[PDB]
Amino acid sequence: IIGVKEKTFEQLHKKCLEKKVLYVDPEFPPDETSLFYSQKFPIQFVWKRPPEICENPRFIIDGANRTDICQGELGDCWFLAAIACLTLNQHLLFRVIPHDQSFIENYAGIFHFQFWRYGEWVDVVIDDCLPTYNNQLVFTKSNHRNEFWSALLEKAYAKLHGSYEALKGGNTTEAMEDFTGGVAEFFEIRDAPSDMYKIMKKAIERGSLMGCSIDDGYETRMACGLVRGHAYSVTGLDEVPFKGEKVKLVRLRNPWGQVEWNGSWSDRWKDWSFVDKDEKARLQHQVTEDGEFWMSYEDFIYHFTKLEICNLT
Ligand SMILES: *[C@@H](C(=O)O)[C@H](O)C(=O)N[C@@H](CC(C)C)C(=O)NCCCCNC(N)=[NH2+]
Ligand SMILES: [Ca+2]
Ligand SMILES: [Ca+2]
Ligand SMILES: [Cl-]
Numbered sequence: 001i002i003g004v005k006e007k008t009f010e011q012l013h014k015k016c017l018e019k020k021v022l023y024v025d026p027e028f029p030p031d032e033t034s035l036f037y038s039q040k041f042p043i044q045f046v047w048k049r050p051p052e053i054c055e056n057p058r059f060i061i062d063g064a065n066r067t068d069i070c071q072g073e074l075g076d077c078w079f080l081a082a083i084a085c086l087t088l089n090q091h092l093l094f095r096v097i098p099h100d101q102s103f104i105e106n107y108a109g110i111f112h113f114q115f116w117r118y119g120e121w122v123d124v125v126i127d128d129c130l131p132t133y134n135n136q137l138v139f140t141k142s143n144h145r146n147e148f149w150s151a152l153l154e155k156a157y158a159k160l161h162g163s164y165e166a167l168k169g170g171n172t173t174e175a176m177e178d179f180t181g182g183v184a185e186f187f188e189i190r191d192a193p194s195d196m197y198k199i200m201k202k203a204i205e206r207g208s209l210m211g212c213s214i215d216d217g218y219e220t221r222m223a224c225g226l227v228r229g230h231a232y233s234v235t236g237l238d239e240v241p242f243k244g245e246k247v248k249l250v251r252l253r254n255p256w257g258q259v260e261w262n263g264s265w266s267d268r269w270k271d272w273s274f275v276d277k278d279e280k281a282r283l284q285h286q287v288t289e290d291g292e293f294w295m296s297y298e299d300f301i302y303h304f305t306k307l308e309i310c311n312l313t
Contacts, residue, residue, distance in 0.1 A: 001016075001019075001021055001023060001024045001026075002015060002016070002023070002026070003026070004025070004026055004027065004125070008123070009110070009112040009123060009125050012110060012125060013106070013108055013110055016108035016109065016110055017106060017108050021108075021109075022049065022108060022109030022110075022127070023108055023109045023110035023127045023128075024109075024127050024129075025125065025126055025127040025159075027159070028126060028127075028155075028158075028159040029127075030047035030127065030129035031047075033163075034158070034159075034163055034164065035131065035163060035164045035165065036163055036164065036165040037162065037163050037165055037166065038165065039165065041073070043073075043133055043138070045131040045132060045133055045138060046131075046132050046133070047129040047130065047131055047132070048129065048130065048132045048135070049109060049127075049128045049129055049130070050103060050128060050130070050148045050151075051103065051107075053130075053132065053135060053136075053137070054145060054146050056146060057103045057146055057148055058102075058103060058104075058146050058147055058148065059101050059102055059103060059111075059147075059148060059149050059152075060097075060099065060147065060149050061142075061144050061146060061147040062144070063090075064087055064090075064093055064097060064149055064150075065087055066084040066087045066088070066233065066235065066253055066292075067142070067143050067257070067290060068087075068142035068143065068144065068147055068149065068150045069083050069084045069087075069140065069142070069150050069255060069257075070140065070141050070142065070143055070150075070255070070256065070257035070291075071140060071255045071256050071257070072137060072138050072139040072140050072141060073138050073139065074138075074139045074140070074164060074167060074168070075167075075168050075169075075218070075219070076139075076140070076154070076167040076168065076170070077219075077230050077231040077255050077256075078169075078170040078171055078172045078174070078175060078211075078231045079154070079157060079167055079170060079172075079175045080140060080154075080231070080255035081172050081175075081211045081231035081232060081233045081253075081255050082172050082175035082176045082178075082179060082209065082211065082231075082233075083150065083153065083175070083179070084233040084235075084253055084255060085176065085209035085210060085211060085233045085234070085235075085310075086176075086179050086180070086209060088204070088207070088209075088235060089207035089209070091207070092179065092180055092207065092312075095114060095121070096113060096114055096115065096153075096179050097113060097114075097149060097153065098112060098113070098114070103148075109127055109128050109129075110125065110126070110127060110128070111125075111126055111128055111152050111156075112124060112125045112126070112156070113126075113152070113153055113156040113157075115156075115157070115160060115178045115179065116177065116178055116179065116180065116181040117160075117178065119181075122160075124156045124157075124159055124160055126152065126155050126156050126159055128148075128152060130148075130151050130152070130155060131164070137151055139151065139154060139164065140154045143257055143290070154167075157175075157178075171308075172211035172213075172231050172308050173186060173211075173308045173310060176209045176211070176308070176310035177310060179209075180209065180310055180312060181312075181313060182208070182209070182310040182311050182312045182313060183310070183311055183313060184308060184309070184310045184311075185308075185309055185311070186306060186307065186308045186309075187306070187307045187308075187309070188305065188306065189212075189301050189304050189305050189306065189307055190305065192301060192307075196301070196307075197237065197248055197297055199309075200234065200237050200250070200307070200309075201237045203309050203311070204234065204235075204236065204237055206311075206312070207312065208309050208310060208311045208312060209309070209310040210233070210234035210307065210308065210309050210310075211231050211232065211233055211234065211307075211308045212231075212232050212234055212252070212304045212306060212307045212308065213229065213230060213231050213232065213304065213305065213306045214226060214227070214228045214229070214230070214303055214304050214305055214306075215228070215229070215305040215306065216228050216229030221259070224261060224262060224263055224303070225259065225260050225261040225262040225263070225266065225293075226261055226303055227254065227256075227259065230254070230255075231255065232252045232253065232254060232255075232304075233252065233253045233255065234250065234251070234252060234307075235251045235252065235253050235292060236249075236250070236251035236283075236294075237249065237250055237251065237297075238251075238282075238283055240275065240279050240283065241275075241276065241279065242271075242274060242275060243274065247296060247297075248296065248297035248298075249265060249283075249294045249295065249296055249297060250294065250295055250296075250297050250300040251283075251292065251293070251294045251295075252292070252293060252294075252295065252300075253290075253291050253292040253293075254291035254292075255291065256291050257290060257291045258289050258290070258291050259291065260289065260290075260291060260292070260293040261293045261295050261299075263295065263299060264295070264296055264299060265293070265294045265295050265296055265299075266293050266294070266295070267285075267286070267287045267288070267289075267293060268287060272285065
């Protein structure tokens with residue numbers, strides 16, 4: 001279609017519109033080479049563009065929110081937790097996602113994203129062919145079936161690593177730095193200082209990204225609703241009145257978009273009845289299986305082992 005070895009998104013976009021053709025990326029083509037390098041995936045995939053998947057595809061629907069990041073059949077929770085964190089700071093999100101992009105205006109089958117690499121912003125261009133099975137995305141999707149920014153972001157990040165398979169292992173902090181240029185620090189929660197709630201509270205209010213995990217030694221599920229060896233996004237911290245004393249809470253989101261903690265302060269916990277109507281509104285309490293839930297600060301430090309904060313420079 002084109003010879004793209006050193007050409008910008010603008011150049012390629014304009015050329016495709018002139019030629020009246022959908023872009024096919026020579027550097028990261030829609031075939032098995034872009035999926036894996038060693039192990040194959042068990043199911044064989046068809047590559048389709050979002051217009052081929054649904055009638056009215058959209059890049060962004062109702063903003064870029066954490067609810068748009070739902071994990072599929074690829075173990076890249078480390079990266080997905082990081083994007084979800086990033087959506088809590090919209091200001092920073094728009095440096096990674098160019099928002100002037102669309103399926104309904106100047107569509108030429110080509111998109112781009114920006115990552116922070118070796119001390120500068122780097123532009124990554126992709127065709128919009130995505131892996132599918134039975135006409136559904138197999139990897140990351142949004143909970144809205146017509147929204148495609150998070151699927152395409154994953155493709156672009158996979159391209160930056162050489163393949164989808166190259167996203168299988170990783171650390172949330174690697175991704176946080178790729179989105180922000182911040183400096184990461186990690187904390188073992190067993191050596192957590194006495195004031196870590198306060199540290200966590202200051203970090204989210206500053207727009208620092210925060211992930212966490214439970215040490216391991218489709219990932220291991222626990223009866224309490226948590227998942228071991230799995231990256232969670234920390235999406236809020238608050239105190240709430242409950243039977244006289246103020247209880248400290250932590251809000252997490254499972255990047256699966258489902259499977260939540262079921263203990264104290266979970267969605268369907270009966271003793272939410274005892275909490276004031278205005279407080280429930282303040283904490284955006286919702287009984288919906290979206291992967292997001294509140295737990296007590298005490299239960300949090302008991303279960304979780306790693307805490308990762310990416311601070312802005
Ligand atoms: C998460 C998932 O989708 O279930 C996925 O299994 C994963 O990548 N888990 C991480 C642990 C999280 C950070 C909690 C993991 O196992 N990481 C090991 C990577 C070792 C370093 N490798 C590279 N390439 N830097
Ligand atoms: Ca959305
Ligand atoms: Ca929930
Ligand atoms: Cl659109």
